[PDB]
């Protein structure tokens, strides 16, 4: 019973994208077992952001995933010690967004500390011109490599009727000893990250659902 | 109609991988509406293949996808003219495989003509040492870009307990005038590609099932 | 006297870029010791080319390099059997070009056979719109890997006052027994590829100079 | 004359590489006109470093570049305000090193502030096993893109007689208003970074030389 049906979240984020320094703080809630969560993010320095917050949204919670088919849950097994994630996202028009995150549990409150370095976003591109309209839903590929949980994803940024593709390369590291966890095998995480509200490039509300599953396609003989 | 619920397939492939010339021929069949098919392939020049056939298997059939949710079918709509596909697969240990394909229809035989270039596969990697154990199931991301259907994918090659990750960049081009197609929107194609039999690095048997669908995840308002 | 002060060149090139099939032929000559050479190219099929021939110029001659500082010449030592090259070129705006080449010798004719596959060039980019204006000079990084000579390069495509960057990944394979060659160590090859004339996307003249060298920077102790 | 034939350097570095947090501090001196400089680095937190310092070494000085051929010096023209640099470095065996740097001037001392995030370096690979033997010399490609100086590079990390290849993507931003500089054209920067001394994987001496120049190769008419 270390995680509850209803969890509080506090997030601190600091970074630079294309030389622009910013800091963000967020508060949220969700059901880790139902795989649902929302969050409110304030830009506290470098407002207004001169780039689409869409690139920061996936930096903002892997404890909140509905696990199907008895798939071992790397993230929840990691408490009370918690876990980190590190990701590089390559954008097909040239942006590169690297982030390192820390997850901790204090009573009922998950604590997120994120560092974000963004480089070579094209000045004319939809990130730096803030023309994006959110993410399509996605499916992460999750597999083990010596007690590290690995992530790969293809994500599509809405740019009117066009889609800008980026590529996620993620490592999830337990702060619990490897020998104390059941590692999952290869599996999938459906993720749907929605921006519900935004104001003056300084305030954002997010909503995310996540489900760990195997392929629904049957395997032949 | 034009496509029957039972189709035959003839494949001709020519290519070079790390300087090793090979030709293949396939004979196959499938229910294009059910999204199921199978294929026997003979390596007719350069057998025994000095690398894992696993890299060529996804070069061997996008007419055979079960479409859910009234998703327009780019492929089936393209007949009688048919379509081409072109792909680059990047392997995270350095291998690149580029292939162009032509799909034609005579009677109730789909004809595939495939050209393949493999470059910079590492000598001691599992493709060139032929130590792969087939593919995980996958989910392609499919989206229009002005008459062109685009595909992106993360696939996972089995190398024992480890997974070798590769990235698909696909373009699908109709030979029907773009005025005469209903383009789909952004969607996913589940793909499970199985190797049922291999012999002497010369004879292979493939089976594949594909479903076009939306995300299983509900959208909040 | 296998390789003369004056050598003739003949090239055969076949390929497809974004669906467009074409063949080209080249006739050339050079001094392979001076590292200078030229080539006339005619599109024999698929003329007029609907993309910049700029992407095909680097597929048109590594026998022609001035070697400084007693650097072992992998290419010249390969005769009479000769050598192959395989290259994938990734453009920062989405294009991939993959190519395999065979180089053989008969008397004083070098015979080039090239297969090219181009994928996912953006419809709106300078290559498919044919708005490029040739290559900056370049320096290739060349280093051995177990009998194979590897090449890495950043090249810059002129687009008025902008530069479209692409990345070369090249493997040079001798058809001569490894043990008959002195493999060079790590070194650079300065290449300047110039397009002297073009005519209705059908006829092209190239000149190229290549120099193999060490860094011109002193090493400290 | 803010800039003289002898300047001093102080560097602060903070980062995480594969989840290992560290800090370093640098003390150096140089002749920014002759393009020569040296730095002493102490690992001040998270010593002993459990990865190759060689990956941080190019995070430790673009003010120190001898400009030939009257090429405009973006770096020198950007004082007193100074400049930033942001780089992502992709290693062909999976590692990514993103970095943001601030360069300031306080009298005769250049002040470097570096944030570093490294993700997804292979546990088995020579970086996390600390088995690299320094860098080959390099040639950076430098070119303007509307007030930003872009850099691209291929660099080779020594691993015995093997070379591990990485790819630099750099943007240099003046903190001086863009319109107050003469932007250079496309040019090259020769860089030779040497580690002269290491101790206890907590103390390191770097020497570097840099020359800005055009191609050594002549242009035909």
CSV table of C-alpha atoms in Angstrom, one decimal, chain D residues 8-215:
chain,number,residue,atom,x,y,z
D,8,UNK,CA,43.0,33.2,-18.2
D,9,UNK,CA,40.0,30.7,-18.0
D,10,UNK,CA,37.8,29.6,-15.2
D,11,UNK,CA,35.3,26.8,-15.9
D,12,UNK,CA,32.4,25.4,-13.9
D,13,UNK,CA,30.7,22.2,-15.1
D,14,UNK,CA,27.7,20.3,-13.7
D,15,UNK,CA,26.2,17.2,-15.2
D,16,UNK,CA,24.6,13.7,-15.1
D,17,UNK,CA,25.8,10.9,-17.5
D,18,UNK,CA,23.8,7.6,-17.3
D,19,UNK,CA,22.5,8.8,-14.0
D,20,UNK,CA,26.0,9.6,-12.5
D,21,UNK,CA,25.9,13.2,-11.1
D,22,UNK,CA,29.2,15.2,-11.1
D,23,UNK,CA,30.8,18.7,-11.0
D,24,UNK,CA,34.2,19.8,-12.3
D,25,UNK,CA,36.2,23.1,-12.2
D,26,UNK,CA,38.7,24.2,-14.7
D,27,UNK,CA,41.6,26.6,-14.5
D,28,UNK,CA,43.4,27.5,-17.8
D,29,UNK,CA,45.3,30.1,-19.9
D,30,UNK,CA,45.8,30.7,-23.6
D,31,UNK,CA,46.7,32.9,-26.5
D,32,UNK,CA,43.3,33.4,-28.3
D,33,UNK,CA,45.0,34.9,-31.4
D,34,UNK,CA,47.5,31.9,-31.8
D,35,UNK,CA,44.6,29.5,-31.2
D,36,UNK,CA,46.4,27.7,-28.3
D,37,UNK,CA,45.2,27.1,-24.7
D,38,UNK,CA,45.6,24.6,-21.8
D,39,UNK,CA,43.2,23.8,-18.9
D,40,UNK,CA,43.5,21.9,-15.6
D,41,UNK,CA,40.2,20.2,-14.6
D,42,UNK,CA,39.4,18.9,-11.0
D,43,UNK,CA,36.3,16.7,-10.5
D,44,UNK,CA,34.8,18.5,-7.5
D,45,UNK,CA,31.8,16.2,-6.9
D,46,UNK,CA,31.1,12.5,-7.9
D,47,UNK,CA,34.8,11.5,-8.2
D,48,UNK,CA,36.0,9.1,-9.1
D,49,UNK,CA,34.3,9.6,-12.6
D,50,UNK,CA,32.9,6.1,-13.6
D,51,UNK,CA,33.1,7.0,-17.4
D,52,UNK,CA,35.7,8.3,-19.8
D,53,UNK,CA,36.5,12.0,-19.2
D,54,UNK,CA,37.2,12.1,-22.9
D,55,UNK,CA,33.4,12.7,-23.5
D,56,UNK,CA,33.6,15.9,-21.4
D,57,UNK,CA,36.9,17.1,-22.8
D,58,UNK,CA,35.3,18.9,-25.8
D,59,UNK,CA,32.9,20.6,-23.3
D,60,UNK,CA,36.0,22.4,-21.6
D,61,UNK,CA,36.8,27.3,-25.6
D,62,UNK,CA,36.0,28.8,-29.0
D,63,UNK,CA,37.6,32.2,-28.2
D,64,UNK,CA,41.0,30.5,-28.8
D,65,UNK,CA,41.1,30.1,-32.6
D,66,UNK,CA,43.7,31.5,-35.0
D,67,UNK,CA,41.8,33.0,-37.9
D,68,UNK,CA,43.5,32.7,-41.4
D,69,UNK,CA,42.5,34.3,-44.7
D,70,UNK,CA,40.8,37.4,-42.9
D,71,UNK,CA,37.9,35.1,-41.9
D,72,UNK,CA,35.5,37.0,-39.5
D,73,UNK,CA,35.8,35.8,-35.8
D,74,UNK,CA,32.3,35.4,-34.5
D,75,UNK,CA,33.7,34.6,-31.0
D,76,UNK,CA,36.1,37.6,-30.5
D,77,UNK,CA,33.6,40.1,-32.0
D,78,UNK,CA,31.0,38.8,-29.3
D,79,UNK,CA,32.9,40.5,-26.3
D,80,UNK,CA,32.4,42.0,-23.9
D,81,UNK,CA,28.9,40.3,-23.9
D,82,UNK,CA,30.3,36.9,-25.0
D,83,UNK,CA,28.4,34.0,-26.6
D,84,UNK,CA,26.8,30.6,-25.7
D,85,UNK,CA,27.2,27.3,-27.4
D,86,UNK,CA,24.8,24.2,-27.4
D,87,UNK,CA,25.9,20.8,-28.7
D,88,UNK,CA,24.4,17.4,-29.0
D,89,UNK,CA,27.0,14.6,-29.7
D,90,UNK,CA,25.7,11.2,-31.0
D,91,UNK,CA,28.1,8.2,-30.6
D,92,UNK,CA,27.6,5.5,-33.2
D,93,UNK,CA,27.4,2.9,-30.3
D,94,UNK,CA,24.3,4.6,-28.7
D,95,UNK,CA,25.6,7.4,-26.4
D,96,UNK,CA,24.3,11.0,-26.5
D,97,UNK,CA,26.0,14.0,-24.8
D,98,UNK,CA,24.0,17.2,-24.9
D,99,UNK,CA,25.6,20.3,-23.4
D,100,UNK,CA,24.8,24.1,-23.0
D,101,UNK,CA,27.7,26.5,-22.3
D,102,UNK,CA,27.9,30.2,-21.3
D,103,UNK,CA,31.1,32.2,-22.0
D,104,UNK,CA,31.6,35.5,-20.1
D,105,UNK,CA,34.5,37.9,-19.6
D,106,UNK,CA,35.6,39.4,-16.2
D,107,UNK,CA,38.7,41.4,-16.8
D,108,UNK,CA,41.5,39.1,-18.2
D,109,UNK,CA,39.5,35.9,-17.2
D,110,UNK,CA,37.0,34.1,-19.5
D,111,UNK,CA,34.3,32.4,-17.4
D,112,UNK,CA,32.8,29.1,-18.8
D,113,UNK,CA,29.5,27.7,-17.3
D,114,UNK,CA,28.7,24.2,-18.7
D,115,UNK,CA,25.6,22.0,-18.1
D,116,UNK,CA,26.1,18.4,-19.4
D,117,UNK,CA,23.5,15.6,-19.8
D,118,UNK,CA,24.6,12.1,-21.1
D,119,UNK,CA,22.0,9.4,-21.9
D,120,UNK,CA,21.9,5.8,-23.1
D,121,UNK,CA,25.7,5.2,-23.3
D,122,UNK,CA,26.1,1.3,-23.5
D,123,UNK,CA,27.2,-0.2,-20.1
D,124,UNK,CA,29.7,-2.6,-22.1
D,125,UNK,CA,31.0,0.2,-24.4
D,126,UNK,CA,34.4,1.9,-23.9
D,127,UNK,CA,32.9,5.2,-22.5
D,128,UNK,CA,31.2,3.7,-19.4
D,129,UNK,CA,34.1,1.1,-19.1
D,130,UNK,CA,36.6,4.1,-19.2
D,131,UNK,CA,38.8,2.5,-22.1
D,132,UNK,CA,39.0,5.4,-24.6
D,133,UNK,CA,42.5,6.9,-25.4
D,134,UNK,CA,41.6,10.4,-26.4
D,135,UNK,CA,40.5,12.1,-29.7
D,136,UNK,CA,42.0,12.2,-33.2
D,137,UNK,CA,42.4,15.8,-34.5
D,138,UNK,CA,39.1,17.0,-36.2
D,139,UNK,CA,37.8,19.6,-38.8
D,140,UNK,CA,34.6,21.4,-37.7
D,141,UNK,CA,32.4,22.7,-40.5
D,142,UNK,CA,31.2,26.3,-39.6
D,143,UNK,CA,28.4,28.2,-41.5
D,144,UNK,CA,25.9,31.1,-40.8
D,145,UNK,CA,22.1,30.6,-40.4
D,146,UNK,CA,20.6,34.1,-39.7
D,147,UNK,CA,22.7,35.4,-36.8
D,148,UNK,CA,23.6,31.9,-35.4
D,149,UNK,CA,26.9,30.2,-36.3
D,150,UNK,CA,26.3,26.4,-36.9
D,151,UNK,CA,29.0,23.7,-36.5
D,152,UNK,CA,29.0,20.1,-37.6
D,153,UNK,CA,31.8,17.6,-36.9
D,154,UNK,CA,32.8,13.9,-37.2
D,155,UNK,CA,35.2,13.0,-34.3
D,156,UNK,CA,37.0,9.7,-33.6
D,157,UNK,CA,37.5,8.4,-30.0
D,158,UNK,CA,40.6,6.1,-29.8
D,159,UNK,CA,39.9,2.5,-28.5
D,160,UNK,CA,43.2,0.7,-29.0
D,161,UNK,CA,43.5,0.5,-32.8
D,162,UNK,CA,39.7,0.9,-33.3
D,163,UNK,CA,38.0,4.3,-33.7
D,164,UNK,CA,34.5,5.1,-32.1
D,165,UNK,CA,32.8,7.8,-34.2
D,166,UNK,CA,30.6,10.6,-32.9
D,167,UNK,CA,28.7,13.4,-34.6
D,168,UNK,CA,28.6,17.0,-33.3
D,169,UNK,CA,25.6,19.3,-33.8
D,170,UNK,CA,26.6,22.8,-32.5
D,171,UNK,CA,24.8,26.2,-32.5
D,172,UNK,CA,26.9,29.3,-31.4
D,173,UNK,CA,24.7,32.3,-30.3
D,174,UNK,CA,26.3,35.9,-29.7
D,175,UNK,CA,24.9,37.6,-26.6
D,176,UNK,CA,25.9,40.8,-28.6
D,177,UNK,CA,23.1,41.9,-30.9
D,178,UNK,CA,23.4,40.0,-34.2
D,179,UNK,CA,23.4,43.2,-36.4
D,180,UNK,CA,26.6,44.4,-34.5
D,181,UNK,CA,28.7,41.5,-36.0
D,182,UNK,CA,30.2,40.6,-39.4
D,183,UNK,CA,29.0,37.0,-39.8
D,184,UNK,CA,31.7,34.7,-41.4
D,185,UNK,CA,30.8,32.6,-44.5
D,186,UNK,CA,31.1,28.8,-44.6
D,187,UNK,CA,34.6,27.8,-43.4
D,188,UNK,CA,36.5,25.1,-41.4
D,189,UNK,CA,38.0,24.9,-38.0
D,190,UNK,CA,40.9,22.5,-37.4
D,191,UNK,CA,40.9,21.4,-33.7
D,192,UNK,CA,43.4,19.2,-31.9
D,193,UNK,CA,42.4,18.4,-28.4
D,194,UNK,CA,45.0,16.4,-26.4
D,195,UNK,CA,44.8,15.1,-22.8
D,196,UNK,CA,48.4,15.7,-21.5
D,197,UNK,CA,47.9,14.2,-18.0
D,198,UNK,CA,45.3,12.2,-16.1
D,199,UNK,CA,45.2,11.0,-12.4
D,200,UNK,CA,42.7,9.0,-10.3
D,201,UNK,CA,39.9,9.8,-12.9
D,202,UNK,CA,39.5,13.1,-10.9
D,203,UNK,CA,42.4,15.4,-12.4
D,204,UNK,CA,43.1,16.1,-16.1
D,205,UNK,CA,45.1,18.5,-18.2
D,206,UNK,CA,43.9,19.4,-21.7
D,207,UNK,CA,45.9,21.2,-24.5
D,208,UNK,CA,44.1,22.5,-27.6
D,209,UNK,CA,45.0,24.3,-30.9
D,210,UNK,CA,42.4,25.6,-33.4
D,211,UNK,CA,42.8,27.3,-36.8
D,212,UNK,CA,39.9,28.8,-38.9
D,213,UNK,CA,40.5,28.4,-42.6
D,214,UNK,CA,39.1,27.7,-46.1
D,215,UNK,CA,39.8,24.4,-48.0
